[PDB]
Amino acid sequence: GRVIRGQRKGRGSIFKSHNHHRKGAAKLRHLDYCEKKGYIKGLVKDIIHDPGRGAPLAKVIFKRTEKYGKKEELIIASEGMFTGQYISCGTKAPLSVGNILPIGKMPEGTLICNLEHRTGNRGTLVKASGCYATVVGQSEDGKKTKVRLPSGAKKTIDAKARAMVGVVGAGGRIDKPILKAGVAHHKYRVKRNCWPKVRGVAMNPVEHPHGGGNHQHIGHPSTVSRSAPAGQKVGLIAARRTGLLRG
Amino acid sequence: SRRTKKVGLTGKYGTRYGSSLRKQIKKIELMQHAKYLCTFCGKTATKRTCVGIWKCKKCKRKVCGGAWSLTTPAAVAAKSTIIRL
Amino acid sequence: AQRVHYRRHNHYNTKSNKVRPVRTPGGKLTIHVVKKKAGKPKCADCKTAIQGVKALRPADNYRARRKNRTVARAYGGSICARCIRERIMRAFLFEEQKCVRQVLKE
Amino acid sequence: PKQITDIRKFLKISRKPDTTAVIIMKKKSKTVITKLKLRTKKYLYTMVFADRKKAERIENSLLPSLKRIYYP
Amino acid sequence: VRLYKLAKRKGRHMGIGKRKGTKNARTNQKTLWIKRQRVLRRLLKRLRDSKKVDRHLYHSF
Amino acid sequence: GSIKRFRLKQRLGKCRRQNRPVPHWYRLKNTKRRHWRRTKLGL
RNA sequence: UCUGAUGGAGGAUCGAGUUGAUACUGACGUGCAAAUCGUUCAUUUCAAUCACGUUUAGGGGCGAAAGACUAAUCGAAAAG
RNA sequence: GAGAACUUUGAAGACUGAAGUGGAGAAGGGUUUCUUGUCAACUGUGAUUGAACAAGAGUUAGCCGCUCCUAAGGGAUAGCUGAAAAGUGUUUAAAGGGGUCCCCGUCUCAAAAGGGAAACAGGUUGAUAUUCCUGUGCCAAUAGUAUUAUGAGUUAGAUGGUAACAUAUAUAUAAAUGAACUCCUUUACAUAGGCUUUACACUCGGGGUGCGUUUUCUUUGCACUUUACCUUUAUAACAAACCUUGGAAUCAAUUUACUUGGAGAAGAGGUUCGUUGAACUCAAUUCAAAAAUUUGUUUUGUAGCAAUAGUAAUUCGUAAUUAUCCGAAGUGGUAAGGACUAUCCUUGAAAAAAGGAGGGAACGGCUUUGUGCUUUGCUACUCUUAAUACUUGUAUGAGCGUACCAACAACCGCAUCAGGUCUCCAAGGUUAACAGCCUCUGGUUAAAUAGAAAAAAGUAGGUAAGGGAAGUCGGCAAAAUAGAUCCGUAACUUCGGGAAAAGGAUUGGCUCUGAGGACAUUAAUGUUAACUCAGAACUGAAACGGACAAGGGGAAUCCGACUGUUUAAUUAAAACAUAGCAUUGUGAAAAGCCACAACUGGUAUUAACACAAUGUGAUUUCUGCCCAGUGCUUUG
RNA sequence: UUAUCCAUUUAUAGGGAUGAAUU
């Protein structure tokens, strides 16, 4: 056989991200003494569209404290935040929508985004449009707090990790039915070369384990083990179950 | 006079796609193309610029909102809980 | 009718190669490349066009006189008059409120 | 090319040491109208005379140091 | 062609058997509407300027 | 084309110069000859 | 609710051009041509068309998937 | 000329028909270009021709391009791998610049369509022209000292307007102090729709000049009647934005459309930019009224360039003279600009380079004490342009391309091959039309041949009585209307469609009638413009979308929902894709999927509304039972 | 926590109570 499409993806030739018009990586402020023991307020000057993603980005201008001047940060905007608004980042920042706080300072039940799964990595979790995590518990001694992620998984992160208060905007995007193939074409034109798909069952056996035959069927179970090699992992990978969920 | 009985703005799609799909897209396009109340100036003139960005024609001020509406119930509820304290 | 041809080595209808016909004293219809229109200078705050300043491309702006590159008022040529007015009132009043807050603290 | 209207600036430019030639153009109009054109390093300065007497007097008062070019 | 244009001016080669484009292609309906609207608005402005109608009457009309 | 590099133009000139016949006074005692339409320079 | 205008949406329609290639299983088939010619046909606001530049190289690439294409060479190119 | 169907000239008949064998370029070619010879071979017939052969010649740039910038990206450095070859490219880098310690900082290449300092007209050759000549401009650069001269400012930095903002007009609007450190703007950006302005294009009428028709008619038909860059071109006008005043519901202003307003509308008066580029009495000038310099009235000038050039004419030795080059408009084709509206799960480059601002570091001159500072006595002094003189190495403008073809014989197809091959300009008539057909400018009358004859057969078309698919696997092929206006339009339907359903009528020419606008005078009277509809008589071998151009419809069944894509050269489909639906894995740098020999990497400028792996394939209605088998998976 | 590994940055302040802001 030959190398299958999934295997070709990792070579990164034509499958690199289409990022010509991206506005920059969305990262919150690098950890600083000001955020460790106080508040620093940045003024949001514009809310822009990053072509790759659905969530709007916010350009926030902070005034540097080490030297005279301003620094521009590209944060992922939470819903309801508006140009001309001052957002506070730090341990003593008030709990308000758009502010960046350590998750240990937030009470239980607050909705957060731009979660830092490890302290200081300036934003890793809960970043897609409309997503939010919930602070569902703080440790007795502090130093640790538990959140519920948009997938429903419970995660335990040290209390010093920062997050934005609120929900990342552009929520409900998935609700619109893409009516036609052209809209999907335009959607993936600015993301990747993952579209159109072409079913493996419509291929020839040389290029896909599903290909071949006189009737367009899989012919062998489509659930493959987690240890299957690269050209073999092609169906439902390491599936614990199949068919419709019932609850 | 009244031009289309029920399709409304989805008359642009003709007969293509399902009726259910067209009705679903109508429900959300109605609010995507609607004007909302700008709480900064009080004039109902904030329209969607991009998927999540809403700009007021008068203020020229833009806010981050929903994909198809200025606000979403989840964000509104979260702000309500925050502002309760 | 007289037909024309490009003269400036660029034979494609790009925006830097926009072209205009003209009748010469010799009775010939020739073609001249027009300069690209430059955007107006814009205010640093509201991003609106600031008046009193010409809208030349950088090469022409370098040759322009200083009189039509600036406005003789504070932030003139960089901030519009309305924004400057609002900035002045804001700067004065936000220090006035700080002073009254300090005097009312005790 | 620049047109100058007042007579003092024309005389001053002619007397200025950078001027080399004066161009005399005469032509019938309907009366013969003329124009005097000082050639300087930068520009050619034209003055238009409808007055035959004025355009007789002015180039005569012009100093003969600088050369003449009669076109017609 | 000048003689043909003169005949057309008298209205002599315009019958329905001489038309090949649609009604709108021959005489743009949008252009006709724009002309009518412009002449009516011009008349209303003239009347209001000369004060032969009241401001509210002008707005209603 | 009309647009050329200096080295390419010099090569064209040399190729033209090498396309002339043997002088008669020398013949009194050439196969490496080409036509522009038949054998292309390729260089 | 109904009527007349206005308005100008749409992977809307006809249709030259472009981009293709349905049929005549026409011509040709020692051709003009190692794929052309004629008529007919499809296509034209978009998943549209073109140019140059640039990336991906052989048990590899690339594939809206025909084992298609990768210099008249492909169920494993070409050169030695 | 030895020799002429295919060399040249004249005449005729025609063609190409501004979507051109017409002009310019790119790729590719490379001298095919030009002139003069010339015919051994080639130019599939001839050939005196030629892209053949031979000898000479021809390509002129500060302004056209490259060169510079950065993009997709390429190479290299540091490392790290690897026997190396090579692979990656900041992954423990002490890696040039600026001011005067500190700040910033991998290098280099990659666009002759992106960004970008600056040129026009006329003429000129056998062959080059924004390159030569003539004239007129523009851009960049111009070191040190000293003189002059130009301007400002000064007893260390100007002034007007309430404001929007404006002001330096010297030959030349050159100078309106300004350090470090900053913050912005320009460069700089998608698509669709109409509206509008301007230039060019086309066209109508008048005047002049020349030509043509003239059996007859014809105040006639045709041609010319031109005006570049540059001068912040000055102004004028207009879309907008802004300022002052004003203070809005009986809401008003206003667009084709909607747009806007107590966060300040209308009205009135202004400011600016942008369009354009002599518009407007624009400038100068003549005449009356305002005062110790304003408003009204005339002449000149294509505003300067500019007529000296160009064009079309009339003459004169054969190079010169003379006359014209000015009075009004319509259509909307192309291009650009403007102000808008709308669309996106699509938001539509960067840098070189340039500009503006915040800030306020430094501070006259002549002489003098002490150690750059306090000091004493006097004041007219600092920048900015230009020229000159001397020093400074020689104190303007580098190098490369520039001919020609661009297919029709100069390119690629083995060729002088009916193929292929990117871009710009785009006249008149008919017309919806850059369609078709015909025509003007330009080009051509050439095609590996001609003459004659003209049967069979072939090929590309026409037409056929009566019948009308009986033909054939199959209506294959052909035929049938087919434009426009008016009328009429079913089942079914996802209510959007079906639909041009089906199916009827009309259409020429001529003579008329009616309707649809703009401009001024003291409600009433004149001047003047588009083609667009509607109606009526008359007329003809009943014909009129007269050529050209131009749907066959209907009743159903199967498949695929649709737009789209595909086996380059036998399969275009019911195949692929698709939206929709469903399932699976993954909470992260000790993760999922994938690449790599290693190092390391892609997704990832990513983070579950995400990425990855599958199946099905719009909508509607549904999606039953089986975990025995084989897979997959969960606990110990 | 010293080997080793990971993340962030300009390696830019020891722990407790919508004007600018630099010499």
Side-chain angles (χ1 to χ4, degrees):
Chain A
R2 57 145 60 93
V3 172
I4 77 179
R5 168 192 66 214
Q7 298 191 263
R8 305 201 277 112
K9 288 251 224 280
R11 278 179 18 108
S13 86
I14 65 181
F15 303 103
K16 310 264 274 309
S17 58
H18 312 309
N19 54 11
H20 188 58
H21 294 286
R22 305 268 184 88
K23 308 281 170 268
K27 300 190 174 312
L28 45 84
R29 227 174 87 80
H30 154 79
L31 253 179
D32 154 24
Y33 162 93
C34 301
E35 301 217 29
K36 296 171 162 144
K37 340 194 164 156
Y39 72 128
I40 170 166
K41 37 185 157 206
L43 164 75
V44 307
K45 292 278 303 166
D46 191 22
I47 304 175
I48 62 178
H49 162 85
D50 193 28
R53 65 179 94 230
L57 296 192
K59 305 177 50 144
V60 193
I61 301 319
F62 292 86
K63 307 218 184 201
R64 315 167 160 267
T65 42
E66 51 285 30
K67 80 156 103 168
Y68 181 60
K70 323 184 136 150
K71 196 186 190 314
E72 174 172 291
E73 311 276 350
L74 263 174
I75 329 296
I76 284 183
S78 50
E79 187 158 327
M81 91 195 308
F82 57 95
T83 58
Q85 153 187 27
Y86 273 99
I87 85 175
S88 322
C89 320
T91 320
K92 319 285 275 308
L95 175 87
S96 148
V97 163
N99 290 351
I100 314 302
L101 273 68
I103 45 182
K105 285 324 175 65
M106 314 173 183
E108 106 290 10
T110 79
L111 301 203
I112 65 163
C113 66
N114 270 118
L115 192 37
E116 233 177 18
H117 97 281
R118 262 152 161 171
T119 306
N121 68 35
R122 52 202 312 217
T124 265
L125 299 185
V126 191
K127 297 172 110 201
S129 69
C131 300
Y132 64 72
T134 311
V135 169
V136 317
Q138 316 266 359
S139 300
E140 301 87 2
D141 63 288
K143 174 182 321 313
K144 194 83 41 183
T145 157
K146 145 160 37 194
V147 315
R148 202 237 308 297
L149 294 182
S151 51
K154 308 275 193 294
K155 203 161 178 56
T156 308
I157 305 117
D158 77 309
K160 271 168 184 2
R162 316 170 274 168
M164 179 176 306
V165 175
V167 181
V168 25
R173 175 168 46 80
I174 288 326
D175 293 0
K176 192 168 190 184
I178 298 128
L179 264 197
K180 61 198 108 152
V183 178
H185 169 263
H186 288 298
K187 158 170 192 171
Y188 294 110
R189 190 169 53 70
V190 294
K191 318 188 92 173
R192 263 164 317 279
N193 193 2
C194 64
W195 187 94
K197 321 168 207 156
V198 177
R199 292 139 34 232
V201 85
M203 276 169 208
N204 287 322
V206 61
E207 64 236 346
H208 205 278
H210 289 184
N214 286 341
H215 276 305
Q216 260 211 20
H217 65 318
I218 320 285
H220 52 79
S222 61
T223 51
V224 296
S225 88
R226 166 79 64 208
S227 64
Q232 216 176 63
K233 271 190 201 163
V234 114
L236 311 179
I237 302 167
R240 279 169 279 248
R241 63 164 311 288
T242 39
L244 283 172
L245 293 322
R246 294 321 191 161
Chain B
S1 45
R2 154 71 71 61
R3 275 176 242 123
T4 57
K5 175 208 241 214
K6 72 181 73 185
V7 314
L9 61 83
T10 50
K12 72 167 105 144
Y13 299 127
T15 67
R16 296 173 305 274
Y17 332 115
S19 59
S20 98
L21 274 206
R22 274 187 279 107
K23 145 198 202 79
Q24 193 181 341
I25 201 140
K26 175 170 157 216
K27 160 171 168 0
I28 89 112
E29 266 203 281
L30 261 173
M31 59 207 186
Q32 168 192 0
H33 292 137
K35 314 203 241 193
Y36 291 79
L37 187 268
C38 174
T39 69
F40 303 93
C41 64
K43 163 160 194 198
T44 303
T46 151
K47 300 217 56 202
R48 208 194 81 155
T49 278
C50 183
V51 50
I53 304 136
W54 297 78
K55 186 159 152 226
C56 176
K57 260 189 99 144
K58 218 198 92 60
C59 305
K60 304 281 165 223
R61 183 197 297 270
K62 66 188 73 183
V63 334
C64 179
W68 328 110
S69 50
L70 182 43
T71 70
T72 68
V76 164
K79 171 159 209 70
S80 278
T81 87
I82 264 67
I83 215 84
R84 265 212 340 265
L85 328 178
Chain C
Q2 308 206 32
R3 303 174 264 197
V4 294
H5 56 85
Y6 281 117
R7 298 212 268 152
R8 284 265 204 90
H9 191 293
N10 191 359
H11 280 69
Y12 303 90
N13 182 62
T14 76
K15 43 193 51 183
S16 69
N17 205 36
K18 293 315 182 168
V19 117
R20 189 158 161 205
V22 63
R23 313 164 40 82
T24 70
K28 308 170 23 145
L29 182 76
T30 197
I31 272 284
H32 290 135
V33 178
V34 312
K35 257 204 310 309
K36 268 188 296 172
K37 201 166 126 63
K40 297 143 160 52
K42 288 165 197 60
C43 168
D45 296 326
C46 54
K47 263 74 191 193
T48 64
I50 58 97
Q51 66 180 108
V53 166
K54 278 213 180 347
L56 313 145
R57 301 202 79 76
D60 302 289
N61 200 47
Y62 173 76
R63 314 191 268 277
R65 287 180 241 283
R66 284 211 71 270
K67 79 195 304 205
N68 32 58
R69 305 212 284 260
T70 65
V71 181
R73 166 200 57 250
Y75 279 73
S78 194
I79 308 267
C80 82
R82 160 194 52 67
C83 282
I84 265 312
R85 172 160 196 285
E86 182 201 300
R87 209 189 263 220
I88 291 164
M89 332 173 51
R90 178 176 281 130
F92 167 67
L93 301 163
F94 285 3
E95 311 295 8
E96 271 315 281
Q97 309 326 315
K98 278 169 208 132
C99 284
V100 307
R101 217 170 61 238
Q102 296 330 295
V103 85
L104 253 294
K105 153 216 54 156
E106 278 305 302
Chain D
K2 312 249 214 177
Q3 169 163 31
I4 59 201
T5 61
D6 89 10
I7 188 64
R8 294 181 260 81
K9 190 178 169 80
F10 184 89
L11 272 304
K12 163 169 93 141
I13 285 171
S14 42
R15 276 186 303 268
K16 209 149 301 283
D18 206 25
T19 314
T20 80
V22 54
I23 290 204
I24 298 104
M25 196 288 307
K26 306 201 183 253
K27 53 179 191 187
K28 235 277 171 192
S29 49
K30 288 309 145 255
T31 89
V32 37
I33 78 92
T34 130
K35 63 191 32 172
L36 301 181
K37 301 135 90 131
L38 300 168
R39 167 79 260 171
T40 82
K41 194 213 284 305
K42 273 290 292 191
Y43 296 98
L44 175 82
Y45 293 94
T46 308
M47 171 95 88
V48 183
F49 295 97
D51 190 10
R52 194 38 174 186
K53 335 289 178 153
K54 225 152 155 216
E56 284 154 6
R57 173 181 40 278
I58 274 298
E59 72 306 351
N60 263 327
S61 84
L62 227 47
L63 271 306
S65 38
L66 80 93
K67 95 183 272 192
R68 270 88 169 134
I69 311 198
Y70 304 80
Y71 263 90
Chain E
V1 70
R2 282 157 190 172
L3 286 176
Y4 195 96
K5 252 56 178 304
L6 286 182
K8 277 183 106 186
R9 215 83 60 65
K10 321 176 64 179
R12 211 60 93 240
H13 301 286
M14 312 265 279
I16 76 104
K18 291 308 261 219
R19 312 176 193 168
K20 294 260 263 164
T22 71
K23 193 183 212 52
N24 176 79
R26 284 173 69 79
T27 164
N28 207 259
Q29 173 194 330
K30 187 160 163 93
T31 303
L32 289 177
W33 162 261
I34 295 184
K35 264 193 52 50
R36 174 148 66 84
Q37 206 56 36
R38 268 172 195 160
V39 309
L40 302 166
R41 269 159 201 189
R42 210 180 299 117
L43 175 53
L44 287 169
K45 300 238 226 289
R46 203 153 283 133
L47 294 182
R48 195 197 47 198
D49 164 337
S50 100
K51 318 213 72 50
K52 297 197 146 227
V53 280
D54 156 78
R55 180 195 27 156
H56 313 125
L57 188 54
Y58 161 91
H59 200 80
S60 157
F61 263 79
Chain F
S2 196
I3 290 157
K4 284 178 270 283
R5 309 295 249 186
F6 175 79
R7 288 261 156 258
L8 184 281
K9 178 163 147 196
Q10 294 302 322
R11 178 65 64 91
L12 295 184
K14 190 179 186 144
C15 286
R16 196 183 66 165
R17 171 177 27 256
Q18 293 184 130
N19 217 1
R20 54 141 301 170
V22 179
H24 294 297
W25 57 265
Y26 194 108
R27 274 267 193 219
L28 255 51
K29 295 172 213 10
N30 87 90
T31 84
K32 277 158 123 162
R33 187 130 194 230
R34 52 140 194 114
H35 188 247
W36 58 267
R37 209 168 193 170
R38 204 168 55 240
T39 289
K40 296 324 244 190
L41 280 182
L43 276 89

